[PDB]
Amino acid sequence: MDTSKLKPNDPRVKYETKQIRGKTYSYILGEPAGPKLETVVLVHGWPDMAFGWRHQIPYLMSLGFQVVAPNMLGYAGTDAPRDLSQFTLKSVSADIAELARSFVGQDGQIVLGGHDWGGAVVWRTAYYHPELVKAVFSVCTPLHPLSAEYKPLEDIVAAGHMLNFKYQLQLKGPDVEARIQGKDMLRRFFRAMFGGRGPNGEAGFSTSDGVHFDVLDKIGAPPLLDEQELEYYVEQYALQEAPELRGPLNWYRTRELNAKDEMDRAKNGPPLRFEMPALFVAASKDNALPPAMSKGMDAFYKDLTRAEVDATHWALTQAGDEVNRVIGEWLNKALG
Ligand SMILES: O=C(NCCCc1ccccc1)N[C@H]1CC[C@@H](OCc2c(F)cccc2F)CC1
């Protein structure tokens, strides 16, 4: 089997939709090489899509896993509901639970992996559906505790806290949604998001201010995508109805809804506890989610394996072969 990364419209995989908890969910499906060991569900983040797992999908197939990688709510061929409650980590976990079981049966179990927002999702999914999740890993995103209260992020960063998250203020607002419409702007956006720079090294995106709209005109080719990959992100994001970024930016509009779900769990729900084998792959140059952010996380796991790869936030691609080996070796030991 060819184990190189997926190309746009790779024929080694299938592209399908299913109705999931009221929404059309599009996904990549890769069938295993050899008798199926497990089904693996892979969850991307922002501003990515299923194709962001392009290094992991053929690899996991070659290891004997069936691989389901959805375009998550708001992204590409998956529906983008208007109701923000559809975008909470709890509802999205329920989405993943139903999609998972639509392949493994209701009595089935999966391996579950996540990155960025997807990492946050899979920890919550492993918390809300421990019957389903046999093993869970996250790249870049560490566990965060059950929210015990709600504070607006404005007031949080105004006090000087969570400064590495202040970009999310712009994202939840109207500026990115209103400005990044159509393929021309989306192309610039993606050059910015995947590391392209301007004639004086101007960054198109920063964790402080978000998208630097004034830079997008001079933004050069991104180092972390090739030209056809870039076009593929543009084409697929274009599947959303204008404003195309509404769905993806909805992930930054649920702080209070998520806080309300989880304050309920902090009060009455079971403890945030993970009994199944778990893997956290840190990224050294991820300035949105620096490795130090995971300090103290191990106390919530019976069985947490830690790794760390030298890469930016985009570790699935930049360090794809290393990430692959880390997942493969951990899975080989987790499941035995
Ligand atoms: O939005 C995200 N990434 C956007 C792209 C970042 C980037 C950097 C450089 C170049 C391109 C892109 N990530 C989400 C991941 C899940 C969320 O986790 C919730 C959460 C907490 F509330 C508190 C503590 C930890 C914790 F995970 C937090 C932001």
Query: Is there a catalytic annotation at residue 44?
Result: no
Three-state SS for 48? coil
Q: Is the peptide bond before 243 cis (omega within 30 degrees of 0)?
A: yes
Total domains in the fold of the chain: 1
Give the Cβ contact number of residue 37 at 10 Å.
16
Resolution of the coordinates, Å: 2.2
Six-digit token pair at 164?
């590495």
Dist. CA 333 → ligand 1 center (Å): 29
Cβ burial, residue 322 (10 Å; 0-12/13-18/19+) = middle
Identify the experimental approach: X-ray
Q: Computed from CA positions of residues 80, 22, 121, 312, in that sequence, does the dihedral angle turn out positive or negative?
A: negative
Q: Computed from CA positions of residues 82, 87, 90, 92, in that sequence, does the dihedral angle turn out positive or negative?
A: positive
Q: Is the peptide bond before 11 cis (omega within 30 degrees of 0)?
A: no
| Residue listed under structure tokens 């709600």 | 150
Dist. CA 193 → ligand 1 center (Å): 13
Nearest CA to 307 among 331, 288, 287?
331
Q: What is 153-199 written as a DSSP string?
A: HHHHHHTT-SGGGTHHHHHHSSHHHHHS-HHHHHHHHHHHHTT-B-T
Six-digit token pair at 110?
């999966």
Mutate to test the pocket of ligand 1, among 157, 165, 167, 255 (most ligand atoms within 8 A of CB): 165
Q: 283 with 308: CB under 8 angstroms?
A: yes
Dist. CA 116 → ligand 1 center (Å): 6
Q: 140 with 283: CB under 8 angstroms?
A: yes
Q: Is the peptide bond before 35 cis (omega within 30 degrees of 0)?
A: no
Six-digit token pair at 97?
């639970």
Ligand 1 atom 14 nearest Cα: 117
Six-digit token pair at 144?
């965060």
User: In the chain, where does DSSP find H-type helix?
Assistant: 56-62, 89-104, 117-128, 153-158, 167-172, 175-179, 182-193, 227-237, 246-249, 255-267, 315-318, 320-334
Mutate to test the pocket of ligand 1, among 313, 316, 317, 318 (most ligand atoms within 8 A of CB): 313
The pairing of beta strand 133-139 with beta strand 110-115? parallel
CA atoms lying within 13 Å on the CB side of residue 211: 28
Nearest CA to 112 among 144, 124, 282?
124
Q: 68 with 103: CB under 8 angstroms?
A: yes
Q: In which domain, by residue range, is 326 found?
A: 1-336
| Residue listed under structure tokens 């079981």 | 101
- What is the rounded CA–CA span in Å between residue 5 and residue 262? 37
- What is the rounded CA–CA span in Å between residue 118 and residue 201? 30
The pairing of beta strand 39-43 with beta strand 14-20? unpaired
Q: Give the H or E element holding residue 251.
A: none
Six-digit token pair at 59?
């690899």
Counts of helices then strands in the chain (DSSP H, E): 12, 10
Six-digit token pair at 257?
């809804």
Six-digit token pair at 40?
């693996």
Six-digit token pair at 167?
């970009």
